[PDB]
């Protein structure tokens, strides 16, 4: 099912703390909509973290 893969790409892959759930970031849900579609690059989780970080950066502009 999808519970395993989403728990994996949140807590195992992203190392993101448990208090940061899907509710505290809508953009996180929109991103895991994309992330789990590919099962590679999971050894270098730093890429996923940097992508999420820069995405939340661009989502928080003023303009």
């Amino acid at each position: 099912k999808r519970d395993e893969k989403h728990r994996h790409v949140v807590n195992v892959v992203l190392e993101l703390p448990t208090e940061i759930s899907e509710a505290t970031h809508p953009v996180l849900a929109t991103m895991l909509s994309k992330y789990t579609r590919m099962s590679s690059l999971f050894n270098d989780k730093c890429a996923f973290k940097l992508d999420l970080l820069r995405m939340v950066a661009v989502s928080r502009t003023r303009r």
Binding site: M31, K34, Y35, L41, D44, A47, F48, L50, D51, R54, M55, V58
Partner: peptide
């Protein structure tokens, strides 16, 4: 691309 999600490029960094 800028602003767009770009995880394949960030993987390609190395």
């Amino acid at each position: 691309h800028h602003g767009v999600s770009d995880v394949p490029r960030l993987g390609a960094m190395d």
